[PDB]
Write a protein that binds this ligand. Sequence first.
Ligand code: MG
Ligand code: MG
Ligand code: MG
Ligand code: MG
Ligand code: MG
Ligand code: MG
Ligand code: MG
Ligand code: MG
Ligand code: MG
Ligand code: MG
Ligand code: MG
Ligand code: MG
Ligand code: MG
Ligand code: MG
Ligand code: MG
Ligand code: MG
Ligand code: MG
Ligand code: MG
Ligand code: MG
Ligand code: MG
Ligand code: MG
Ligand code: MG
Ligand code: MG
Ligand code: MG
Ligand code: MG
Ligand code: MG
Ligand code: MG
Ligand code: MG
Ligand code: MG
Ligand code: MG
Ligand code: MG
Ligand code: MG
Ligand code: MG
Ligand code: MG
Ligand code: MG
Ligand code: MG
Ligand code: MG
Ligand code: MG
Ligand code: MG
Ligand code: MG
Ligand code: MG
Ligand code: MG
Ligand code: MG
Ligand code: MG
Ligand code: MG
Ligand code: MG
Ligand code: MG
Ligand code: MG
Ligand code: MG
Ligand code: MG
Ligand code: MG
Ligand code: MG
Ligand code: MG
Ligand code: MG
Ligand code: MG
Ligand code: MG
Ligand code: MG
Ligand code: MG
Ligand code: MG
Ligand code: MG
Ligand code: MG
Ligand code: MG
Ligand code: MG
Ligand code: MG
Ligand code: MG
Ligand code: MG
Ligand code: MG
Ligand code: MG
Ligand code: MG
Ligand code: MG
Ligand code: MG
Ligand code: MG
Ligand code: MG
Ligand code: MG
Ligand code: MG
Ligand code: MG
Ligand code: MG
Ligand code: MG
Ligand code: MG
Ligand code: MG
Ligand code: MG
Ligand code: MG
Ligand code: MG
Ligand code: MG
Ligand code: MG
Ligand code: MG
Ligand code: MG
Ligand code: MG
Ligand code: MG
Ligand code: MG
Ligand code: MG
Ligand code: MG
Ligand code: MG
Ligand code: MG
Ligand code: MG
Ligand code: MG
Ligand code: MG
Ligand code: MG
Ligand code: MG
Ligand code: MG
Ligand code: MG
Ligand code: MG
Ligand code: MG
Ligand code: MG
Ligand code: MG
Ligand code: MG
Ligand code: MG
Ligand code: MG
Ligand code: MG
Ligand code: MG
Ligand code: MG
Ligand code: MG
Ligand code: MG
Ligand code: MG
Ligand code: MG
Ligand code: MG
Ligand code: MG
Ligand code: MG
Ligand code: MG
Ligand code: MG
Ligand code: MG
Ligand code: MG
Ligand code: MG
Ligand code: MG
Ligand code: MG
Ligand code: MG
Ligand code: MG
Ligand code: MG
Ligand code: MG
Ligand code: MG
Ligand code: MG
Ligand code: MG
Ligand code: MG
Ligand code: MG
Ligand code: MG
Ligand code: MG
Ligand code: MG
Ligand code: MG
Ligand code: MG
Ligand code: MG
Ligand code: MG
Ligand code: MG
Ligand code: MG
Ligand code: MG
Ligand code: MG
Ligand code: MG
Ligand code: MG
Ligand code: MG
Ligand code: MG
Ligand code: MG
Ligand code: MG
Ligand code: MG
Ligand code: MG
Ligand code: MG
Ligand code: MG
Ligand code: MG
Ligand code: MG
Ligand code: MG
Ligand code: MG
Ligand code: MG
Ligand code: MG
Ligand code: MG
Ligand code: MG
Ligand code: MG
Ligand code: MG
Ligand code: MG
Ligand code: MG
Ligand code: MG
Ligand code: MG
Ligand code: MG
Ligand code: MG
Ligand code: MG
Ligand code: MG
Ligand code: MG
Ligand code: MG
Ligand code: MG
Ligand code: MG
Ligand code: MG
Ligand code: MG
Ligand code: MG
Ligand code: MG
Ligand code: MG
Ligand code: MG
Ligand code: MG
Ligand code: MG
Ligand code: MG
Ligand code: MG
Ligand code: MG
Ligand code: MG
Ligand code: MG
Ligand code: MG
Ligand code: MG
Ligand code: MG
Ligand code: MG
Ligand code: MG
Ligand code: MG
Ligand code: MG
Ligand code: MG
Ligand code: MG
Ligand code: MG
Ligand code: MG
Ligand code: MG
Ligand code: MG
Ligand code: MG
Ligand code: MG
Ligand code: MG
Ligand code: MG
Ligand code: MG
Ligand code: MG
Ligand code: MG
Ligand code: MG
Ligand code: MG
Ligand code: MG
Ligand code: MG
Ligand code: MG
Ligand code: MG
Ligand code: MG
Ligand code: MG
Ligand code: MG
Ligand code: MG
Ligand code: MG
Ligand code: MG
Ligand code: MG
Ligand code: MG
Ligand code: MG
Ligand code: MG
Ligand code: MG
Ligand code: MG
Ligand code: MG
Ligand code: MG
Ligand code: MG
Ligand code: MG
Ligand code: MG
Ligand code: MG
Ligand code: MG
Ligand code: MG
Ligand code: MG
Ligand code: MG
Ligand code: MG
Ligand code: MG
Ligand code: MG
Ligand code: MG
Ligand code: MG
Ligand code: MG
Ligand code: MG
Ligand code: MG
Ligand code: MG
Ligand code: MG
Ligand code: MG
Ligand code: MG
Ligand code: MG
Ligand code: MG
Ligand code: MG
Ligand code: MG
Ligand code: MG
Ligand code: MG
Ligand code: MG
Ligand code: MG
Ligand code: MG
Ligand code: MG
Ligand code: MG
Ligand code: MG
Ligand code: MG
Ligand code: MG
Ligand code: MG
Lengths: 48, 275
Amino acid sequence: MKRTWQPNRRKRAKTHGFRARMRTPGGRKVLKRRRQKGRWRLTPAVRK
Amino acid sequence: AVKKFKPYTPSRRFMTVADFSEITKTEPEKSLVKPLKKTGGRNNQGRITVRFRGGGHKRLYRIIDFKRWDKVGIPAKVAAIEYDPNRSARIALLHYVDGEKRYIIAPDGLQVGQQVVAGPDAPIQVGNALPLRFIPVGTVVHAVELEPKKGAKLARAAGTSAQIQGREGDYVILRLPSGELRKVHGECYATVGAVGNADHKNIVLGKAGRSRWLGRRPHVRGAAMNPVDHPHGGGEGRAPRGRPPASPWGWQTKGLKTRKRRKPSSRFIIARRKK
RNA sequence: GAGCUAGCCCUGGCCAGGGUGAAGCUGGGGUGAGACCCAGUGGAGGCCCGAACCGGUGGGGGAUGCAAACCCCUCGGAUGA
RNA sequence: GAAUGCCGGCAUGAGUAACGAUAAAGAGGGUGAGAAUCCCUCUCGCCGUAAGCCCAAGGGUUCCUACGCAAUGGUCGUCAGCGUAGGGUUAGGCGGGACCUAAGGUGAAGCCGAAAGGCGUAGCCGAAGGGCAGCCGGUUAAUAUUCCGGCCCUUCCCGCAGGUGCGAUGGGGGGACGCUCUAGGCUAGGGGGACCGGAGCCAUGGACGAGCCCGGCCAGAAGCGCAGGGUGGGAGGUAGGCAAAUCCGCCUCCCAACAAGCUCUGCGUGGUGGGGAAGCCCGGGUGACAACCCCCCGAAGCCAGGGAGCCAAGAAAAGCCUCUAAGCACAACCUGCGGGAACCCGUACCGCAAACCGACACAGGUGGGCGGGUGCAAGAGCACUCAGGCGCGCGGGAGAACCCUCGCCAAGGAACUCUGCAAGUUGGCCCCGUAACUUCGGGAGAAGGGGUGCUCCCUGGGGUGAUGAGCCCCGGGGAGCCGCAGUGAACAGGCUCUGGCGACUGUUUACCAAAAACACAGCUCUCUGCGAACUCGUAAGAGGAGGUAUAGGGAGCGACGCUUGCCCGGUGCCGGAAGGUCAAGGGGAGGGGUGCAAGCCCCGAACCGAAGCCCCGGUGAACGGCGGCCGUAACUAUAACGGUCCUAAGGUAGCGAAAUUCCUUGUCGGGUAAGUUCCGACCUGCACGAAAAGCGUAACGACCGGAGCGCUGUCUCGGCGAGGGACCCGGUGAAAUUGAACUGGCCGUGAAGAUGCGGCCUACCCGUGGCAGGACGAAAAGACCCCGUGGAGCUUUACUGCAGCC
RNA sequence: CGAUGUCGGCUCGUCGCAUCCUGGGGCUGAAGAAGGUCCCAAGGGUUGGGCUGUUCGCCCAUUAAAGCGGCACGCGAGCUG
RNA sequence: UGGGAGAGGGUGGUGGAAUUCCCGGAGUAGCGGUGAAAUGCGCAGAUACCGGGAGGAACGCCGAUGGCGAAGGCAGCCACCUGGUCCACCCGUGACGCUGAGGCGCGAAAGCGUGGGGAGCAAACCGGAUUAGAUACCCGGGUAGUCCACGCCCUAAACG
RNA sequence: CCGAGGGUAGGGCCCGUGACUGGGGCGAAGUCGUAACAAGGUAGCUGUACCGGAAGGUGCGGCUGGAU
Ligand SMILES: [Mg+2]
Ligand SMILES: [Mg+2]
Ligand SMILES: [Mg+2]
Ligand SMILES: [Mg+2]
Ligand SMILES: [Mg+2]
Ligand SMILES: [Mg+2]
Ligand SMILES: [Mg+2]
Ligand SMILES: [Mg+2]
Ligand SMILES: [Mg+2]
Ligand SMILES: [Mg+2]
Ligand SMILES: [Mg+2]
Ligand SMILES: [Mg+2]
Ligand SMILES: [Mg+2]
Ligand SMILES: [Mg+2]
Ligand SMILES: [Mg+2]
Ligand SMILES: [Mg+2]
Ligand SMILES: [Mg+2]
Ligand SMILES: [Mg+2]
Ligand SMILES: [Mg+2]
Ligand SMILES: [Mg+2]
Ligand SMILES: [Mg+2]
Ligand SMILES: [Mg+2]
Ligand SMILES: [Mg+2]
Ligand SMILES: [Mg+2]
Ligand SMILES: [Mg+2]
Ligand SMILES: [Mg+2]
Ligand SMILES: [Mg+2]
Ligand SMILES: [Mg+2]
Ligand SMILES: [Mg+2]
Ligand SMILES: [Mg+2]
Ligand SMILES: [Mg+2]
Ligand SMILES: [Mg+2]
Ligand SMILES: [Mg+2]
Ligand SMILES: [Mg+2]
Ligand SMILES: [Mg+2]
Ligand SMILES: [Mg+2]
Ligand SMILES: [Mg+2]
Ligand SMILES: [Mg+2]
Ligand SMILES: [Mg+2]
Ligand SMILES: [Mg+2]
Ligand SMILES: [Mg+2]
Ligand SMILES: [Mg+2]
Ligand SMILES: [Mg+2]
Ligand SMILES: [Mg+2]
Ligand SMILES: [Mg+2]
Ligand SMILES: [Mg+2]
Ligand SMILES: [Mg+2]
Ligand SMILES: [Mg+2]
Ligand SMILES: [Mg+2]
Ligand SMILES: [Mg+2]
Ligand SMILES: [Mg+2]
Ligand SMILES: [Mg+2]
Ligand SMILES: [Mg+2]
Ligand SMILES: [Mg+2]
Ligand SMILES: [Mg+2]
Ligand SMILES: [Mg+2]
Ligand SMILES: [Mg+2]
Ligand SMILES: [Mg+2]
Ligand SMILES: [Mg+2]
Ligand SMILES: [Mg+2]
Ligand SMILES: [Mg+2]
Ligand SMILES: [Mg+2]
Ligand SMILES: [Mg+2]
Ligand SMILES: [Mg+2]
Ligand SMILES: [Mg+2]
Ligand SMILES: [Mg+2]
Ligand SMILES: [Mg+2]
Ligand SMILES: [Mg+2]
Ligand SMILES: [Mg+2]
Ligand SMILES: [Mg+2]
Ligand SMILES: [Mg+2]
Ligand SMILES: [Mg+2]
Ligand SMILES: [Mg+2]
Ligand SMILES: [Mg+2]
Ligand SMILES: [Mg+2]
Ligand SMILES: [Mg+2]
Ligand SMILES: [Mg+2]
Ligand SMILES: [Mg+2]
Ligand SMILES: [Mg+2]
Ligand SMILES: [Mg+2]
Ligand SMILES: [Mg+2]
Ligand SMILES: [Mg+2]
Ligand SMILES: [Mg+2]
Ligand SMILES: [Mg+2]
Ligand SMILES: [Mg+2]
Ligand SMILES: [Mg+2]
Ligand SMILES: [Mg+2]
Ligand SMILES: [Mg+2]
Ligand SMILES: [Mg+2]
Ligand SMILES: [Mg+2]
Ligand SMILES: [Mg+2]
Ligand SMILES: [Mg+2]
Ligand SMILES: [Mg+2]
Ligand SMILES: [Mg+2]
Ligand SMILES: [Mg+2]
Ligand SMILES: [Mg+2]
Ligand SMILES: [Mg+2]
Ligand SMILES: [Mg+2]
Ligand SMILES: [Mg+2]
Ligand SMILES: [Mg+2]
Ligand SMILES: [Mg+2]
Ligand SMILES: [Mg+2]
Ligand SMILES: [Mg+2]
Ligand SMILES: [Mg+2]
Ligand SMILES: [Mg+2]
Ligand SMILES: [Mg+2]
Ligand SMILES: [Mg+2]
Ligand SMILES: [Mg+2]
Ligand SMILES: [Mg+2]
Ligand SMILES: [Mg+2]
Ligand SMILES: [Mg+2]
Ligand SMILES: [Mg+2]
Ligand SMILES: [Mg+2]
Ligand SMILES: [Mg+2]
Ligand SMILES: [Mg+2]
Ligand SMILES: [Mg+2]
Ligand SMILES: [Mg+2]
Ligand SMILES: [Mg+2]
Ligand SMILES: [Mg+2]
Ligand SMILES: [Mg+2]
Ligand SMILES: [Mg+2]
Ligand SMILES: [Mg+2]
Ligand SMILES: [Mg+2]
Ligand SMILES: [Mg+2]
Ligand SMILES: [Mg+2]
Ligand SMILES: [Mg+2]
Ligand SMILES: [Mg+2]
Ligand SMILES: [Mg+2]
Ligand SMILES: [Mg+2]
Ligand SMILES: [Mg+2]
Ligand SMILES: [Mg+2]
Ligand SMILES: [Mg+2]
Ligand SMILES: [Mg+2]
Ligand SMILES: [Mg+2]
Ligand SMILES: [Mg+2]
Ligand SMILES: [Mg+2]
Ligand SMILES: [Mg+2]
Ligand SMILES: [Mg+2]
Ligand SMILES: [Mg+2]
Ligand SMILES: [Mg+2]
Ligand SMILES: [Mg+2]
Ligand SMILES: [Mg+2]
Ligand SMILES: [Mg+2]
Ligand SMILES: [Mg+2]
Ligand SMILES: [Mg+2]
Ligand SMILES: [Mg+2]
Ligand SMILES: [Mg+2]
Ligand SMILES: [Mg+2]
Ligand SMILES: [Mg+2]
Ligand SMILES: [Mg+2]
Ligand SMILES: [Mg+2]
Ligand SMILES: [Mg+2]
Ligand SMILES: [Mg+2]
Ligand SMILES: [Mg+2]
Ligand SMILES: [Mg+2]
Ligand SMILES: [Mg+2]
Ligand SMILES: [Mg+2]
Ligand SMILES: [Mg+2]
Ligand SMILES: [Mg+2]
Ligand SMILES: [Mg+2]
Ligand SMILES: [Mg+2]
Ligand SMILES: [Mg+2]
Ligand SMILES: [Mg+2]
Ligand SMILES: [Mg+2]
Ligand SMILES: [Mg+2]
Ligand SMILES: [Mg+2]
Ligand SMILES: [Mg+2]
Ligand SMILES: [Mg+2]
Ligand SMILES: [Mg+2]
Ligand SMILES: [Mg+2]
Ligand SMILES: [Mg+2]
Ligand SMILES: [Mg+2]
Ligand SMILES: [Mg+2]
Ligand SMILES: [Mg+2]
Ligand SMILES: [Mg+2]
Ligand SMILES: [Mg+2]
Ligand SMILES: [Mg+2]
Ligand SMILES: [Mg+2]
Ligand SMILES: [Mg+2]
Ligand SMILES: [Mg+2]
Ligand SMILES: [Mg+2]
Ligand SMILES: [Mg+2]
Ligand SMILES: [Mg+2]
Ligand SMILES: [Mg+2]
Ligand SMILES: [Mg+2]
Ligand SMILES: [Mg+2]
Ligand SMILES: [Mg+2]
Ligand SMILES: [Mg+2]
Ligand SMILES: [Mg+2]
Ligand SMILES: [Mg+2]
Ligand SMILES: [Mg+2]
Ligand SMILES: [Mg+2]
Ligand SMILES: [Mg+2]
Ligand SMILES: [Mg+2]
Ligand SMILES: [Mg+2]
Ligand SMILES: [Mg+2]
Ligand SMILES: [Mg+2]
Ligand SMILES: [Mg+2]
Ligand SMILES: [Mg+2]
Ligand SMILES: [Mg+2]
Ligand SMILES: [Mg+2]
Ligand SMILES: [Mg+2]
Ligand SMILES: [Mg+2]
Ligand SMILES: [Mg+2]
Ligand SMILES: [Mg+2]
Ligand SMILES: [Mg+2]
Ligand SMILES: [Mg+2]
Ligand SMILES: [Mg+2]
Ligand SMILES: [Mg+2]
Ligand SMILES: [Mg+2]
Ligand SMILES: [Mg+2]
Ligand SMILES: [Mg+2]
Ligand SMILES: [Mg+2]
Ligand SMILES: [Mg+2]
Ligand SMILES: [Mg+2]
Ligand SMILES: [Mg+2]
Ligand SMILES: [Mg+2]
Ligand SMILES: [Mg+2]
Ligand SMILES: [Mg+2]
Ligand SMILES: [Mg+2]
Ligand SMILES: [Mg+2]
Ligand SMILES: [Mg+2]
Ligand SMILES: [Mg+2]
Ligand SMILES: [Mg+2]
Ligand SMILES: [Mg+2]
Ligand SMILES: [Mg+2]
Ligand SMILES: [Mg+2]
Ligand SMILES: [Mg+2]
Ligand SMILES: [Mg+2]
Ligand SMILES: [Mg+2]
Ligand SMILES: [Mg+2]
Ligand SMILES: [Mg+2]
Ligand SMILES: [Mg+2]
Ligand SMILES: [Mg+2]
Ligand SMILES: [Mg+2]
Ligand SMILES: [Mg+2]
Ligand SMILES: [Mg+2]
Ligand SMILES: [Mg+2]
Ligand SMILES: [Mg+2]
Ligand SMILES: [Mg+2]
Ligand SMILES: [Mg+2]
Ligand SMILES: [Mg+2]
Ligand SMILES: [Mg+2]
Ligand SMILES: [Mg+2]
Ligand SMILES: [Mg+2]
Ligand SMILES: [Mg+2]
Ligand SMILES: [Mg+2]
Ligand SMILES: [Mg+2]
Ligand SMILES: [Mg+2]
Ligand SMILES: [Mg+2]
Ligand SMILES: [Mg+2]
Ligand SMILES: [Mg+2]
Ligand SMILES: [Mg+2]
Ligand SMILES: [Mg+2]
Ligand SMILES: [Mg+2]
Ligand SMILES: [Mg+2]
Ligand SMILES: [Mg+2]
Ligand SMILES: [Mg+2]
Ligand SMILES: [Mg+2]
Ligand SMILES: [Mg+2]
Ligand SMILES: [Mg+2]
Ligand SMILES: [Mg+2]
Ligand SMILES: [Mg+2]
Ligand SMILES: [Mg+2]
Ligand SMILES: [Mg+2]
């Protein structure tokens, strides 16, 4: 049957991307937190 | 008059359609259409604020001239009567001797090739627009403004009209379609005659499919829901209303008047409606 | 978090073949004129039969599964909400 | 030492289940340490509207070659989508960008919000939509519309020649549009050829033949041809298209008008460049100077912005053309020609799947295009089969029970069972024929029955040609032949009578309910005069609606037919300038604290003082309600009739043991040999009833009843047979569960159901195939039930708040 | 209550005997034939259908007879539902 | 051919009186109703009076025992469209007639459907009376309907 | 080949009959009320509609076959 993950690069980058997070208060906090924890990738990798 | 079908489907047994007799031109003036933006009953938040909307036929919005005091004295020939999907009345296309082309709502009895004109000096004949002060008491008018130079607001739907009743100072007394008696400023423009396509109301949609074509999604009764949804929800089996019949939001829905009583227009409304 | 799902908005696409044969149209009859009737033409419809496609009625299988909803047979819709 | 404790390790179940579609395999030859599994050949089977090919997503080197086999691969492995390494993706024309806009997003101006932020016309971003210039072939191990070959084309810059009032982000035209049906002419694709090319063949009884087999095309500028698309021309007047305008719009006159002309596209042709089969031979060579022609079929594609019909009335913006404004008219633009210039990203490979989504090389899911041939009426159905791709990454035996999927069955024929559940029967086409009822459409494929292959002879009309032959299509009539049987295989309704509920087509509990539920046209009440009511938001702002009472909201009811009674005392809603009650506030009689004082401070009566409530009235398709007792008629029984208590008023029509009836299998009638169900009646309706509508109702229903006919392994009552398992051998090898175990019967006892205690009885040790009575067998800290001053959803005339409104 | 699956059927039995039948008896208001009633006796046997989920029960046609109970109201790691 | 009379029919317009409702004024203790009463309305200002407005229906006098039509039936007034009929002239046609089973059309009122409109009236319905009782006759209310258009219904003491 | 007829299926007409049900006639020795004939105590009758235990009533229009 049709499962939940249906990959879509434009959907990925435009929903979770760096420029989406930066545009909003909660989004910047996600980046502040992820930088404070030491995440190697602040944002999902999309082949773009 | 309305057109019936033979019962060659279950739904054709009752379906009725407009005869479209008065229509003379099947395509809209290219300069006067513009794209009508489907809302689906949703607002700038993207929330439904008017339920059960959307999914109807695509339309273009024919621009209508709801002022006409635009062009006083400049006559125009009635060039065509057309189907407007955005309203129940039909529209008539005017070729002004100006060269300018405009739609109005088509009055009952307007004939192609006839001339009409707007102004204080206009004749008292169907299709002509004047300030109400210069329309003989007793004649029936449509496309009435509510305040001077603000646009036509009253008596716009298929088959409707309003009747001048008397003059009291700067104001006239109109009987609105609803039976309401109201003062309107005399300098408000109107158009002698009633709105056409008076058979619009004798139409029988005939099937659920037809409502859908009009952008009307199905309506869900309160009694068919659950307590979280609606005052009339819940109950085991069917259930009577078991409270004063209420809206989805809980206000009473059989007789509760909802006009704001301190509204400034109350000074101008002589008598609340009939029927 | 609406890349699942629900509704809507925008823009594209898809629906083998077969059957029924509405209005209208022309001709003929009819009449004072008509209604109307007959034949032909026509090709309507949340029309009929049935693939794709969308479903999921009954039964059997599966039940540490091929599968955290699947398989077989049968069955519903298939120009339309 | 226990926490169904936590982490880790290792056991048991066990050489057990399983090894992932029942499309299928055999042999020979090679490689190698090793071969059912790798390569090669022959034979076999499977797919072929796909299980073949191309494209978009998504994946990200999985591509190619060499060298490998520890692990990964459900076995094996010499093989691989695995390990190591090297190589591989080439564009002005393909896709995206240096173009345009859609919803939407963002957002100068502007608006709003404690902050963060929310909106917002223009503009900008935003594509699979608009727009725009490349086709065939060859080449590599691996890319090709990209490299090469041939033939074409676009834009930009500069120059030349001719031409013109040139000039735009501004004005206009156009771009520019639906659904269904559809003409003419073409092409894709297909079939046939007695004709053209071709390596060969003659078997096994016949055939040297109009023999078999194979193939008989592709692209192409200008010109030409055929077919279509688009567009009228000139003059004058001109107040409109937020300036201007010669453009467009509008009015008038004149030729022209279903013509032509002009323009544009498709198809054909076309200089030229290509390709080119079987077979034989070791991807290539030959075939071959290959031939390259005629005929029929024919699109859903093309001409296209075609045509008609219909109502639900069917994007935008740029490119483009035209108009002008500043400006500039040595410029600028247009047209032809020539030379120069032409950037960035993608391109491998999988792509219905072993490379994507499903933890797996997972029977599931995944959007677009091509998808041949023959036959069956048609078709993308069905059977076979081409090109092409496969045999599904464990095998070999055996021939038990049992299981699964399948085949047949004597006599009977629903006797099975909760139910014909399941499975039979029926089954396409053509012809005859067809009932109650009906809303006149239907019911209807009603029911029922006849035909159906092949051969020969005669024969009617059409399509292409030409009018004919040929080919192709639709027929008709005779006479015959065979078999158990002619839609000879595959695909393809069992039917009828009668109730309930719902009018109907639709919708639903993704993953236990598809229904009588929801929806639905339609009916009624009700609110709302437009800055509408109503909804979302603190607000701004939105929706409603670029709508205006034939409209929009809310509610109930639910096609249609005939109808929809009585009660306004209570609640709700509406109407009511009187009266009663009524908060802050106003008012200040009176009283008080203090001061030596003038003064300051505090209390406070009458009276005035809103909505709301009380009060008066209306209102049922508003919430809702709709009785008891006694007595009376020439026999009994019953009570039309009177009496009386009560109520706001006492259930009308119609229906009734019903989806409602307790007593109940009520009684009676029907059907049956027999009927707690079913149908029809009756009425003491425990406990129908009129828009939570009442009573009906053609047609419709994978809804739920009852009956019959047909036919059946459902059954009497079972038998045999087939394949996949089960079993055995080789290979790999789990699981829940598990205090430890050296784990028998009875009758007793024991916390009341003992392998484990007593007494007696029985019993050599250990396995394998089987069956399920026990181990109060496993699974999940019972969902039931209660308990906890535990939680949560929901309701209201519970309490107390808040928003909202007054 | 860190679960002992609860009606009825089907299948498969086994047991008790307060015996339905068949065998042996005494008494009779036992003429015979046929019964009534009590005693012994559990070896075997104890039918097919209509109704209803039913157990039960009624009814149809038979029968020597159409017995009643226990086994977690026997039996869902055996099926049904 | 030339005249006449007429509520014959159709359509469109239009006048005044009265009723009821609403607004304004003025005024107060009742009004209304009956055989007599009561319900009802009225100090929340009724009735009676003056002014204004709205709306529907019906047309006083003329009106008669009258006129017209085949019947049903037709009544303010203006116009348009149209039917039948009488008269005088004795001009034209030359038995072209009378009747009429079927057919077709028309057809008061009530009733139906779809949509309007609704002042007065008024089935049903509610109340008050009267009465032995009073599902009536009388009284106060009141919904269909009465009116308009379109389509049906096709009846009658449709009678002379 | 035709063919008596037999068989399958589906229709039409008539007759008998049927739980139950509708009114009709007659009976008279009953119960209710008194609708009509007199102005019959509301003049009558009438088509139609709605309603009432019953005769009947009321509305609308019509007739006189109505007394004063
Ligand atoms: Mg997707
Ligand atoms: Mg992904
Ligand atoms: Mg993407
Ligand atoms: Mg994408
Ligand atoms: Mg996206
Ligand atoms: Mg982003
Ligand atoms: Mg990480
Ligand atoms: Mg790092
Ligand atoms: Mg992040
Ligand atoms: Mg019309
Ligand atoms: Mg119709
Ligand atoms: Mg029709
Ligand atoms: Mg019709
Ligand atoms: Mg129907
Ligand atoms: Mg219309
Ligand atoms: Mg029409
Ligand atoms: Mg029209
Ligand atoms: Mg435009
Ligand atoms: Mg618009
Ligand atoms: Mg809009
Ligand atoms: Mg927005
Ligand atoms: Mg938003
Ligand atoms: Mg929304
Ligand atoms: Mg809403
Ligand atoms: Mg909506
Ligand atoms: Mg309607
Ligand atoms: Mg629409
Ligand atoms: Mg609706
Ligand atoms: Mg609804
Ligand atoms: Mg519910
Ligand atoms: Mg919720
Ligand atoms: Mg709540
Ligand atoms: Mg609630
Ligand atoms: Mg409720
Ligand atoms: Mg309830
Ligand atoms: Mg409920
Ligand atoms: Mg319940
Ligand atoms: Mg209930
Ligand atoms: Mg419910
Ligand atoms: Mg309910
Ligand atoms: Mg319901
Ligand atoms: Mg309730
Ligand atoms: Mg209710
Ligand atoms: Mg209640
Ligand atoms: Mg106003
Ligand atoms: Mg689109
Ligand atoms: Mg289709
Ligand atoms: Mg036809
Ligand atoms: Mg036509
Ligand atoms: Mg449909
Ligand atoms: Mg259909
Ligand atoms: Mg169809
Ligand atoms: Mg169909
Ligand atoms: Mg299924
Ligand atoms: Mg089945
Ligand atoms: Mg089966
Ligand atoms: Mg099963
Ligand atoms: Mg499962
Ligand atoms: Mg299947
Ligand atoms: Mg099927
Ligand atoms: Mg199907
Ligand atoms: Mg179908
Ligand atoms: Mg179809
Ligand atoms: Mg369509
Ligand atoms: Mg659609
Ligand atoms: Mg311890
Ligand atoms: Mg444990
Ligand atoms: Mg454990
Ligand atoms: Mg542990
Ligand atoms: Mg642990
Ligand atoms: Mg074992
Ligand atoms: Mg199989
Ligand atoms: Mg090997
Ligand atoms: Mg090996
Ligand atoms: Mg090989
Ligand atoms: Mg095959
Ligand atoms: Mg991956
Ligand atoms: Mg590789
Ligand atoms: Mg290995
Ligand atoms: Mg190895
Ligand atoms: Mg491995
Ligand atoms: Mg595997
Ligand atoms: Mg090796
Ligand atoms: Mg591999
Ligand atoms: Mg290399
Ligand atoms: Mg190139
Ligand atoms: Mg550039
Ligand atoms: Mg694009
Ligand atoms: Mg391009
Ligand atoms: Mg080309
Ligand atoms: Mg490649
Ligand atoms: Mg390459
Ligand atoms: Mg110029
Ligand atoms: Mg321009
Ligand atoms: Mg447009
Ligand atoms: Mg488009
Ligand atoms: Mg071609
Ligand atoms: Mg062919
Ligand atoms: Mg070809
Ligand atoms: Mg041609
Ligand atoms: Mg000008
Ligand atoms: Mg070659
Ligand atoms: Mg050569
Ligand atoms: Mg040659
Ligand atoms: Mg097609
Ligand atoms: Mg067209
Ligand atoms: Mg329409
Ligand atoms: Mg259009
Ligand atoms: Mg736009
Ligand atoms: Mg200048
Ligand atoms: Mg030029
Ligand atoms: Mg650049
Ligand atoms: Mg690049
Ligand atoms: Mg490439
Ligand atoms: Mg698939
Ligand atoms: Mg595909
Ligand atoms: Mg692969
Ligand atoms: Mg999974
Ligand atoms: Mg595999
Ligand atoms: Mg797979
Ligand atoms: Mg092909
Ligand atoms: Mg076939
Ligand atoms: Mg076929
Ligand atoms: Mg098929
Ligand atoms: Mg083939
Ligand atoms: Mg295999
Ligand atoms: Mg064996
Ligand atoms: Mg048999
Ligand atoms: Mg049978
Ligand atoms: Mg039989
Ligand atoms: Mg049955
Ligand atoms: Mg019948
Ligand atoms: Mg019929
Ligand atoms: Mg039908
Ligand atoms: Mg048949
Ligand atoms: Mg039938
Ligand atoms: Mg043969
Ligand atoms: Mg098959
Ligand atoms: Mg078949
Ligand atoms: Mg079928
Ligand atoms: Mg069957
Ligand atoms: Mg039937
Ligand atoms: Mg029903
Ligand atoms: Mg239904
Ligand atoms: Mg339903
Ligand atoms: Mg119905
Ligand atoms: Mg319905
Ligand atoms: Mg339905
Ligand atoms: Mg459908
Ligand atoms: Mg569920
Ligand atoms: Mg479900
Ligand atoms: Mg779930
Ligand atoms: Mg669920
Ligand atoms: Mg299910
Ligand atoms: Mg379900
Ligand atoms: Mg269904
Ligand atoms: Mg539902
Ligand atoms: Mg429903
Ligand atoms: Mg209704
Ligand atoms: Mg706003
Ligand atoms: Mg708005
Ligand atoms: Mg708007
Ligand atoms: Mg609106
Ligand atoms: Mg409903
Ligand atoms: Mg009927
Ligand atoms: Mg009553
Ligand atoms: Mg009440
Ligand atoms: Mg009340
Ligand atoms: Mg209450
Ligand atoms: Mg009030
Ligand atoms: Mg007073
Ligand atoms: Mg004082
Ligand atoms: Mg003191
Ligand atoms: Mg009502
Ligand atoms: Mg109550
Ligand atoms: Mg109620
Ligand atoms: Mg009752
Ligand atoms: Mg009953
Ligand atoms: Mg019933
Ligand atoms: Mg009941
Ligand atoms: Mg009970
Ligand atoms: Mg009782
Ligand atoms: Mg009962
Ligand atoms: Mg019972
Ligand atoms: Mg019984
Ligand atoms: Mg009994
Ligand atoms: Mg039953
Ligand atoms: Mg039952
Ligand atoms: Mg009884
Ligand atoms: Mg309800
Ligand atoms: Mg109900
Ligand atoms: Mg259904
Ligand atoms: Mg159903
Ligand atoms: Mg069997
Ligand atoms: Mg066999
Ligand atoms: Mg076997
Ligand atoms: Mg086998
Ligand atoms: Mg076997
Ligand atoms: Mg052995
Ligand atoms: Mg031990
Ligand atoms: Mg024990
Ligand atoms: Mg024991
Ligand atoms: Mg022991
Ligand atoms: Mg022990
Ligand atoms: Mg001891
Ligand atoms: Mg012991
Ligand atoms: Mg023993
Ligand atoms: Mg066991
Ligand atoms: Mg056990
Ligand atoms: Mg044990
Ligand atoms: Mg146990
Ligand atoms: Mg057990
Ligand atoms: Mg639990
Ligand atoms: Mg716990
Ligand atoms: Mg517990
Ligand atoms: Mg518990
Ligand atoms: Mg308890
Ligand atoms: Mg407590
Ligand atoms: Mg406690
Ligand atoms: Mg608590
Ligand atoms: Mg709580
Ligand atoms: Mg409110
Ligand atoms: Mg327990
Ligand atoms: Mg446990
Ligand atoms: Mg347990
Ligand atoms: Mg004996
Ligand atoms: Mg004897
Ligand atoms: Mg004895
Ligand atoms: Mg015995
Ligand atoms: Mg024994
Ligand atoms: Mg029983
Ligand atoms: Mg019983
Ligand atoms: Mg016997
Ligand atoms: Mg017990
Ligand atoms: Mg027992
Ligand atoms: Mg018991
Ligand atoms: Mg038991
Ligand atoms: Mg049991
Ligand atoms: Mg079980
Ligand atoms: Mg059981
Ligand atoms: Mg067990
Ligand atoms: Mg067991
Ligand atoms: Mg069962
Ligand atoms: Mg059950
Ligand atoms: Mg008079
Ligand atoms: Mg007279
Ligand atoms: Mg003469
Ligand atoms: Mg009449
Ligand atoms: Mg009448
Ligand atoms: Mg009516
Ligand atoms: Mg009224
Ligand atoms: Mg009395
Ligand atoms: Mg009525
Ligand atoms: Mg009515
Ligand atoms: Mg009437
Ligand atoms: Mg008379
Ligand atoms: Mg015979
Ligand atoms: Mg009398
Ligand atoms: Mg009298
Ligand atoms: Mg009388
Ligand atoms: Mg009655
Ligand atoms: Mg009575
Ligand atoms: Mg009465
Ligand atoms: Mg008369
Ligand atoms: Mg008399």
